[model samples]
Target chain A: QVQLQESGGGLVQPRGSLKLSCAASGFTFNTDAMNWVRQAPGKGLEWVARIRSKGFNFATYYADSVRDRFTISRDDSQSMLYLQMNNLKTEDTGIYYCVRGRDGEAMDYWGQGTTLTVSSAKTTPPSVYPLAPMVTLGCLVKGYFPEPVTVTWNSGSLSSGVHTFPAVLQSDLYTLSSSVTVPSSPRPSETVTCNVAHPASSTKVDKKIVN
Target chain B: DIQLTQSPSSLAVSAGEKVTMNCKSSQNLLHSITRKNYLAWYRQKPGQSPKLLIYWASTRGSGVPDRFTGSGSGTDFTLTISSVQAEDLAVYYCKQSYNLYTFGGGTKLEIKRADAAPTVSIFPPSSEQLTSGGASVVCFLNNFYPKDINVKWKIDGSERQNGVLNSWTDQDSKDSTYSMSSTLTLTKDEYERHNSYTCEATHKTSTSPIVKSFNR
Candidate 1:
């Protein structure tokens, strides 16, 4: 009957820091121990850190991979647990969950999961190219990370024939392409815009075409 | 608004037999604009072309045989061949129009008694599909007909059913026959421990199942 929820992870820069908060309900927080686990998209779960607190006394454990650059804490009064991560990398881009368990019992309650996306330090804008019909136009976003981007047709979206290819990883960087099939022929005077957005970039990068 | 999946990947029925195919969308297929399910059905008979059979989910298309009936609403729909004829032997597809216009995987219709033995072939996962933890092996059943053939994947002479999937059969216009594929997925450990896989097919034309072996 207890519920665990997590929040507060977003577009962090490589080698930067991350902060996540886990809130618990329907049960007293001080009575239970919490664990932090992460999973790469389409991959399995990995243990990272854990914490057990009772007001003035608390104990924590961490995986060696992140032990040197991670912090775990809690506030029993608010029934909340926190995780602070440092030196983020593209490989760290994944879904993070906070859950509760006993010393040896299996993890029984899990948070809905907080998505953590770490962006590449160097941002690469997308390239828009003319396409044959599907009369489609594609914007290729390469050398980007955490692998999230949006491609719009004329600043709008179409469902049919719109495909966002899975992100490709290479040389520690990520790349993907999104193409849209224009629903109908546009007038010669109309301009089609493919707006690309990456959290690494402060502003949206876009390409336009005169049909 | 919904993701649609069609079922009964293959079927075998004689003329005058009643047949039905099912489709279900994850979200509502109906649009409030027209208060109608923006769905359509098409039939592509062997060697010919796909022709529209129904629109708005239940409206029969112009000149479409009355034996075909489209029904259902919202997220679930059905296409029934009241009494299928020999000419109706082919694959049927269902398409959704509420959003990006996704088409169903299709249903293969086989008229009983017609048989064209398939040539069995197998292939390992491609680079894109190949991963460190698993592999998807493809067993292709092509140059076949009547769509009633039994296909199976085996390892060490034992049938493997886990992680198995099938694609809709397609009819070749030139030959008027049918072809389809079944995929067998194995973990990296399983695929490595067992490098030999078998693709077997049993048809009405043969008392024994024809099989092809693959090693990777």
Candidate 2:
């Protein structure tokens, strides 16, 4: 009995590129070997390598220096595994699993998880430097797999409020980190933003701190 | 394909003292498929990860902790640490993945002397004796050496705790024998006053790691 299933997208936006899919059933896809694992929400789990039955692939010494953007393809009579990740970054969000290498690459059989999130749209900048009384609204988020990102400060006013956080950066690819904090408004049309989420992309980096 | 080189890739060990890790497999996976010899060994600690400490490789997965042992075979495999504590310090990985799930590049157990006294062992050596409605148990393992062998029954000692495990490997004329046969079905008054049983063997050149205990 063999089984593995992982479908993608929970949320993505930062740089944009978090695609996932690993579908296998009952066995017989040349025979064996198919692996891809990365977990970073709570932590522990890193073995992003494999895709063999003849297609031959290996990248796990820390993804062997990026490993050509981590790509894998398969369909051998529907053993399906079409994992892809090109430029997208943040840390590449987390929680990805796919296994079946029972002969010498070791990943017995596993897959029933899929959560990718990469978001952004709140990079602080509303203009405030009247004599430098005080105004700082900064937001920056790049991607690869930006762990479960969240940077918030929604006190409401600058067009409704929004702020969220939760990132781990699973790996079929990787990179993710989030942060947010604001307080300094005497009123000049206040709006401090920096939004980022991940699965693939989401971005927001605003500016306007003028007094 | 034997190629498992696990050296000082990790080690900060201290809790008592004694932590060894080494696995080398480049090509002697011992072929016989379902018959036995599919080797296994797993352990990953820290933030809670990695399990199955020794499969057909050293046989110890349920409640594992008899000082954690898994001798050697094939390209010389070993994952020992007779004495060490501090919650075991986490980070000790070794995997054959049971037939082919290789891992080993971790070791970290620190706690100089919180009183110092850590050496665990009280595993499947409960005297060994069990018989139900089909009794045939024979195993003689010297340290850690396998070519093929499988016998499983689990719950308290989990590998996800499934049930019924029967693996057999035999080729004889003089010197080729890997064995496995497991069947547990009792109800004749529970097979006449005899319960408690556990035997796990999965070997393919020291991967099964033996753990035998019986009572019927």
Candidate 3:
């Protein structure tokens, strides 16, 4: 008759860490153990960790793959179980669930899963310059990890006429190239900027076309 | 880890009929040290989350009806509904917590309804201001028995597949009958157009699909 609920922040930055809690109700918490389970989008389920709550003794167990990054703990006074993972990556984005069990038995009840998304901050500033004829501007951004970035120009004003090449893998990272054509040459005092936004960082690089 | 596999992925039945679902594990779920089998059963109705039914192989969860029974040992387990009721239609899952916990795929129970069909309703966006910011349209299928139901969306009578669709069995504390819902997201433009959007639900119980539509 126990009811378990999972709560946690929905987003995490790459290389950052996150903590999730499972609160139990409808039953005495000290009588059973709680386990954390996770499933990535379109992937099978995985056992993340477990916390056992016995009268005066408590124990914890973690999956081999996440043992170094995950720590499971319990708060008997509050009837709560906690899971913390450090050095997170994009691959960690998924739905996490908490379930109740006894005597190392199967999880009988589960809480609705909480979705977590891990994104990288901005990394490796782009290089911007004018192509031949001085009317075509080119921006090259390289050395970024974890794909899916938002590349923009003129503060996201220009959405069309801008072509972004497919991201290429380089040294286990990502590199992208984008270009835009201008109708006329840039003014001496004007600056053309390319802004690259990723989960890890949001940065813009400027190139003086007429300087 | 003890893996669980369920059989007869789905079934069709009538009210008052008896139904049994089986679950087999890759290895024995019994613990030599504890001398207990680590098995549990859960029931998930449409539009609702899964609820625990039995634990420790044969013990019924609190408030569970006596008609729903779970029994098994070693690596074999069975969940039986002595008299299938209208509300007994749902997907059942078996789980083993011997080492690492694992769940069986699931077995869906369908109640054959010769005269009854699902009732559909559309819930549009709550706020008109959010119409331009994209919104979701939810289709609720109420008082349905069989779990074998399909819901689809259409715009101006043309089928649209760009939106995400999700359905769940509802937690009904009243009758044994079940309710379900499906949600579809619409883009900013699609919502602003105020065009006619339709949600169609199809089931074997009805010869024709049940359609519900909403404008704007």
Candidate 4:
């Protein structure tokens, strides 16, 4: 039986690049190809790209944004294949996976997975909801290994009253959904935000409630 | 990628009551190629291992019965028996043919009572999951098991009204050998869930069988 394992840095800054690796065992590295997958928090899975042990490479629909930074390489002596993604953005956050490919470039095996989180200083998103009525704010995330997350609704200051919700667990390549509600305010531009707290970061995905 | 251990290895089901087959992958099969998950179902009669029943997750294999279906994804894919009959009695297996060759242990189906209602329901009869398009599921049984097995589609527990079900035999000068393969037509939903489907293998006169599932 052949197996692949994924390991990498779990944290990244906004506009920074993310790097990860897939280690192969029980098989010759040059005999197969390797591919990468991504799962955002509360979202479905996506195929990022693929690299062959013989130097064949293909990109996903998002190749343009990730092409230069995302790459794969092999180490036949150690039977390992490396995967890297650079120039990471906030939207690039998610769990990454590596797949082992068979003769025809088909994925015959896969790695466990690695997670990367990105944070930004932007405080909030433009208000999109109507005012004086019930309103809810939500943020989407993707990742590989399952982990607990925290979502909070905060007022102007970090110390202001904050409403929190527990995170959902995403196994492998699947999306997860999380949200929080707030009472509609008389002010049309009252701030209602969502911040995620995870072992990777304490960054916030903020949104303003519209009246 | 993960080792799935299916319990009861085989189950004996009586007529009427529905049978529940469970497949737990050693790890999750959540991949981006198939946004949701991949899984399939199959049955095998006496002297046989099993046959393809469902694929991707809930889409039924071509020529399968409305009574047999699959659900769930990732690590927990389920195969449900809407109603079990004498003809339905046989071994059942679950597989994830989305990214690698992985399968659940075998569950044998045996005849029992003949009047129980099926518990699992197919709501709205969805074609939503299979968004990827058309695909084929092929299963190959090694030469060790010959003549004792048959494969095809069945509806409502009765074999399909018409189709070609073929088997080839090979006996080498060195050793007796036989190999068999069956292909099933799948819908778009089936393609999105799993690209291919497969099943169990039993050596001639052997009590144990090895089941496998793969995706491409």
Candidate 5:
């Protein structure tokens, strides 16, 4: 019954700080461990940090690359954890993920990713949001420029069941959000993808949220 | 020049206990020309002077007792004591004369009762502490029981008594050992003399302190 939800990744300016968040449930936070791993766009997985319980206290281990500017800590009372990455740079661009496990092994549960970019807001693709309740699920598609993009639903693009709003010019970039009515909820094997067609990079970023 | 490596680096024992330690040389201590194993062993207790015990590999010094015997040849050698008494509480060192003089790291004999021995190590100060004037030092001890352990600081061979604080811990279940960290705060120039410091660790195991140092 172990579960995790990772948040906090969008755009972090260079030399700025980036803080990642992870909330845990269904398992004892005081007795389990959490790992934060990052994978650069085309590069391999890099382990960022890990925190494990040693009775009333916990131990923090961070990768050498993050030694000087990174701090990973937690709030056992809230069963929540967070990592602060300072002085972010272009080389730090990638997908940051979280996993819950025990000292014996890692990743008993995996929550895909949160992308922090050195790339343009519009140049980035859409993020698939997986939430519960048999109602309309909001799909978040943020930041981009010179607006010429389409936001919709897929596996089978249900045009009529999908609802989209005009991109609000938030900050220098705008967040394009949409919703898809899922009265029947997705099948366990089915994935409802929030598709974004951004005419920018050669890469099309889109992920499926498996029900 | 030859190098000597000693074994059973330390021990904890009682009055009637039999003790043995080895001192092996990197190069043969026996000179082919003289055909003699020019090895020597000495005893020194507390703050007293060193007394020659054995020389030429097996010959005990004039007034040395029969209990302290030396054996082996070439590069491998051993010193044994049939039994020890309270007066036997001392330090013993082996040396080689075939080459330029070299002394083995001395072996210590200390009386004890169920002292499980401790691993002694040293650490420098933290960045924040380093930002200030006085150089700092830490004595790390782990893997021992009885929670009854003492850690002392020695700089240039003199024992320090102030600014040493101990952060303790519980016994590690698997190995049944306890761990502790102690630090010594000193003036900036105390570390200037030799840029060296030593951690003398003594556990309930024995009065024979295990010493670890930071030196060039």
Candidate 6:
């Protein structure tokens, strides 16, 4: 079986470009064509671009949607296919995969996906709160552009019923909700906080509950 | 351009059952000079990316099980999966690269279930260096069931009507879904001032619109 592995440079900037490499093994790389495919987070797959391999002659094709922004090439010396997408946008962020295509133009083998995120320096924090009567503490994190976030509670411990919801889609941004049910309500002096960590920023929101 | 169409948009089959799907291209996908059909088959599992199964008409992709077969020629094609496993449940697609790349609408294989809402993510434009030339930002959304979605863009804080936007549904067989992207073009002045942009997506499955913002 032919194995394909994709490697990418994480955290691309806007208007910047990203280069992804797909290394192939178990078959002669030049014997067939290699194609690049991508999937944005929570989205289906896209045929971004492809390069045909015929001995020393290599031809390329790009999806019309990405034709202006993508370049597909090959490195026979390393048995690898290369994808470079310029003019990066937040929408350009996602998982990129590579597949080998038969001479007849079918993609047969695939590579594990590589995740890419495009972001800027500005960051948004989450909003946290304690439910009525202080039964549960909820954290609402929204407007945090880009993905792969780590959310936690500053209380140093979590309740058994702690749950973190998947990132909710909001226009071009994302919102995530997580909550923890405390065994008992805290005294007026007690403090609980929700902390979120992202590549752009790490922020916290704290609320003091009253008895 | 060769237009491709798939039949029986969706079907439900149990594990261990056999299933076959058909694809018809508007024109022959065979290249007389190469004597090879520019056809390929793909499978897209729920919540996952599409995988190539068969190509060049009949040749199975590497690591693809022998039971998965690609057959037919010219303008007609079929993909058959024998004794399907639970993991084999997904939407299948046929694409022809004979001319400009074109894909069949797709056939979805399911076990019967309610429609799932689409999960969306938007990537706002990242920071850029000041340059004389302008820049463009993009927003992408995906993974919603039912293959229907709408996207709109806003400049600074107000909705903008004129921009380049594109959206398409996944060609998977049963788990059909929709995804879209929109671009906001910025002039050199807008880039210098660091404008704020936002992308909003609406779907019937969603209770409220999903929104993301980007500041250049």
**Candidate-wise lDDT, in order:** 0.67, 0.47, 0.68, 0.49, 0.64, 0.67
Q: CA shift at A141, candidate 4, in angstroms?
A: 20
Query: Candidate 6 lDDT, tens digit per residue, B1-216?
Result: 567888778877665778888999889888898788888888877645577787788888768889998899899888888987656767788888786566677787765334566544444332231242544454545445555677777777777776444534333333333344445555656656656777887777778988877665
Q: Which ten residues in a row have the lowest lDDT in candidate 2 chain A?
A: A124-133
lDDT of 2 by residue, B26-67 (tens): 655444564334556655443333555666567676567888
Residue-level lDDT tens digits of model 5 in B1-216: 477877766765666788898889988877787677888786655423345688878888766789989998899999998777757766677867563345677777655434467666565543333455555565556556666777888877878887665565433323334566665666666655566678888775775778887672
User: Cα lDDT for residue A189, model 3?
Assistant: 34
lDDT of 2 by residue, A101-156 (tens): 54443445567557665556322212111111123232223224433344443423
Interface root-mean-square deviation, each candidate: 19.5, 26.1, 17.4, 21.4, 30.4, 11.6
Candidate with better DockQ, 2 vs 4 = 2
- TM per candidate: 0.38, 0.27, 0.56, 0.33, 0.33, 0.55
Tens digits of lDDT, candidate 1, B9-56 = 888777679999998888887777768887778755542334568878
Among residues 3 or more apart in sequence or in different chains, the pairs in candidate 5 whose N, CA or C atoms overlap within 3 Å are A121-A143, A122-A143, A122-A144, B115-B205
C-alpha lDDT of residue B44 in model 6: 79
* Candidate maximizing lDDT: 3
Report how closely model 3 matches the true complex, as a DockQ value: 0.08
- Of 2 and 5, the candidate ahead on lDDT is 5
Considering just the first chain, candidate 6 attains a TM-score of 0.61
| Candidate 3 lDDT tens digits, A1-211 | 5677888745578889999998888888878888887766544456688877775377788877687898888887898888898988788887788877666445667788777768644344333332221244545454565554556767777554455555555545565555554556442335666666664345445433332
Ten contiguous residues minimizing lDDT sum, candidate 5 chain B: B169-178
Q: For candidate 1, give the lDDT of residue B59.
A: 84
Ranking by lDDT: 3, 1, 6, 5, 4, 2
Candidate 3 or 4, higher lDDT? 3
